Symmetry: C6
Subunit: 29 residues, 6 copies
Amino acid sequence: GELKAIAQELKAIAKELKAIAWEHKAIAQ
Amino acid sequence: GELKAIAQELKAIAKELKAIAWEHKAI
Amino acid sequence: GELKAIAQELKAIAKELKAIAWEHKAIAQ
Amino acid sequence: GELKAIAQELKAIAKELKAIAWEHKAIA
Amino acid sequence: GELKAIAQELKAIAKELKAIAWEHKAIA
Amino acid sequence: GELKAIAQELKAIAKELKAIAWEHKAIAQ
Ligand SMILES: [Br-]
């Protein structure tokens, strides 16, 4: 379904944001 | 429901953005 | 309702991007 | 209604994204 | 539509995100 | 459909995020 595909994109977005959040944390040494 | 699920992913999103807002406040 | 839930999480999202905007604004000024 | 409320939050999100971009450009 | 309107704001979001990556591309 | 249109913008959004994500990594290096 298209609602399911919408959740899938939101999920991929969340993990990209997860990674960036981690970079900032790492970069904060 | 797939709307509930959509909401969950937005919740996770706000969680990461919050973490990011902080690490900026932390640098 | 579930659409309300979605709108509420987008409000929260908009908020964090506001905070992030301010921190960047800070770095500049 | 609710779909409207969603568009207006998106709008607000777009606006804040634009604010961040401006601040990036403004460092140099 | 309202759905149509949501897509336009999401399109606006994509655009601002693309501007952020451009400034970042300038730094990096 | 309009839902597919929405899912496609979310796909475009994930892409730019991904690029920004790779920008932060390059700085980390
Ligand atoms: Br950023």
